[PDB]
Amino acid sequence: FVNQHLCGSHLVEALYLVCGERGFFYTPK
Amino acid sequence: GIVEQCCTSICSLYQLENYCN
């Protein structure tokens, strides 16, 4: 699921699943 | 940033993890 173009909610989804309880930051601009 | 690496090019686990805390 991570080895493709990921945009918008699709990219957030991937961060959420990979990072788990560590959390993440989403800074698109 | 993440859009350039993962949206306008192909993402990777290595790069995604750069954005975990």
Swiss-Prot record, chain A:
GN (gene name): INS
Stated name of the protein: Insulin B chain
Stretch of the intact protein here: 25 to 53 of 110
Effect ascribed to mutating F24S: In HPRI; Los-Angeles
Domain of life assignment: Eukaryota
